[PDB]
Paper text:
To elucidate the molecular mechanism of substrate recognition, the crystal structures of FjGH66 in an unliganded form and complexes with glucose, IG2, or IG3 were determined at 1.18 to 1.85 Å resolution. All crystals, except the IG3 complex, belong to the space group C2, and the space group of the IG3 complex is P212121. The conformations of Lys429 are identical between the ligand-free and IG3 complex structures (not shown). The crystal structure of FjGH66 shows that some sugar-binding subsites can accommodate α-(1→2)- and α-(1→3)-branches.
Earlier, we identified dextranase (FjDex31A) and kojibiose hydrolase (FjGH65A) in the dextran utilization locus (FjDexUL) of a soil Bacteroidota Flavobacterium johnsoniae and hypothesized that FjDexUL is involved in the degradation of α-(1→2)-branched dextran. FjDexUL consists of eight genes that encode proteins Fjoh_4428–Fjoh_4435: SusR homolog (Fjoh_4435, hereafter FjDusR), SusC homolog (Fjoh_4434, FjDusC), SusD homolog (Fjoh_4433, FjDusD), SusE/F homolog (Fjoh_4432, FjDusE), GH66 enzyme (Fjoh_4431, FjGH66), GH31 dextranase (Fjoh_4430, FjDex31A), GH97 enzyme (Fjoh_4429, FjGH97A), and GH65 kojibiose hydrolase (Fjoh_4428, FjGH65A). FjDexUL glycoside hydrolases synergistically degraded S-32 α-glucan. Collectively, FjDexUL proteins are suggested to be involved in the degradation of α-(1→2)- and α-(1→3)-branched dextrans.
Author numbering: 39 to 110, 113 to 586
The structure:
Amino acid sequence: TAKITLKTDKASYKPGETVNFTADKVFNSSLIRYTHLGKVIKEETFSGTSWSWLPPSDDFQGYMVAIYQTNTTQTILGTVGIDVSSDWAKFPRYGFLSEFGNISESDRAAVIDNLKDYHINGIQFYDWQYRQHQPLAGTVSNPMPVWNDIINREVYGSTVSGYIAQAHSKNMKAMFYNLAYGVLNDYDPNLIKQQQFVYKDANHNDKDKHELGWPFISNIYITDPANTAWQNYLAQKNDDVYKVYDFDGFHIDQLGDRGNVFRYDGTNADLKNAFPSFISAMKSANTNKKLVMNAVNQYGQKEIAGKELDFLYTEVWSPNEGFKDLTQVLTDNAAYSNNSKNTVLAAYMNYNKANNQGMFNTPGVLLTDAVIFAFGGSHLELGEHMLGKEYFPNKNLSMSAELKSSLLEYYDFMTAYQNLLRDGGTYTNPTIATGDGKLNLGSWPPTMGKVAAVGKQVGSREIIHLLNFTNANSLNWRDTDGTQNVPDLIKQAMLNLNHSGKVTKIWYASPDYNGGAAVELSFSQNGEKVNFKVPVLQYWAMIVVE
């Protein structure tokens, strides 16, 4: 629907770094407007397809840039969000890579550039590694140029390093996947002793294992993350990696709750309580390297939320299948971290559908990211393709050109307005009411048939999110079979808001309307009672009262 595709050269920008813009088209009588939280901070003539802007230098600030044509009113031509951050961890927008074979440099560039346009600021390299117990193939002095992975696919070192370089060139961090504790059947028993493993019983008979059939090479066997011999072994493995591949850090994965399992000596392995010492030991060994750890279905989250992790990560499973279950994870993560850490959700959309070639269900994907983004979360979902399954190379489902377009606007939006979405504040219930019957308004958690209003006091602003369940035919976020409805647009819906405190300005932004650029609304205020009209509600509208 946008006339123009507006992009920048990098995914994000440290303070003092220049932003280089490309537009695909030029139009006459147009203006580039730079906004910070809805306020114009610069305008200039739209003059060509390529120009630059040096952003203000305050750290951790999101901006929107919007090109307008003047009609003999103004029409939005297209938008881009910009993130000024010194470091990804405050506002993580996490993506993946999953294929590391003989892939050309231009093919790799097209992958990274596309991730760059979603402002992805870090990438989890998934199944890059040789083995869980030896991520580096070969030696530091003599690294193997080609190896085979857990599915016996070829991985090229030069593809790994090439993607690390390309990610770096776009201001993205590179995080190497491995398990915290994983060992395959070709490990060296001289190095990883019996004493190190986790067992299904007290008599060190049977080792705990995640069973994998063909074409996987091995079951994943399981060590004690608290075991210091294990820790020192794996620190050496990590160091080797770092000396060969210039990863910024270690994305620590695990298999989630193993139920009731045991150490060599018969004591409860209680793995959630073993992770803290593991994380500390990994950080201690490579103090310059970042750590993120997957609390699978929250297993370990409370125990690890206080440790040296850049931000928190949760892979979401049953029984956390409701929209209200994703916000419970986000609320619990804030509480476990004492409001220190934001969260990334791994939450694989259209999961059952992804048993076969097909399309992602656009409305299910968008409704999901609306809830996630609106509540200050982030979704790990984009790499070479979008995730349909926990096995990231699975690319059975494609994104329509419409979904691609739309999701770019959703990433623009959660970037531009990060300062409002996930940079402090308190959730409140706004006292709001339809003025014209056009909205059937409720609170959070949501109700099918209703628009849910979510309030956040963020410094001196009042934020109101409208999240549209009017046409929802389920409240399960995964939309596993791709059945979720596209919501009908609601237009020009009058809202009544109690707000004591003089209102100065009210503004609207939605990723569904005008590329998420701020629109100032008309309003009246009669003592406490404030009215105004929202232009368009489809999935997700944000109202901001200053």
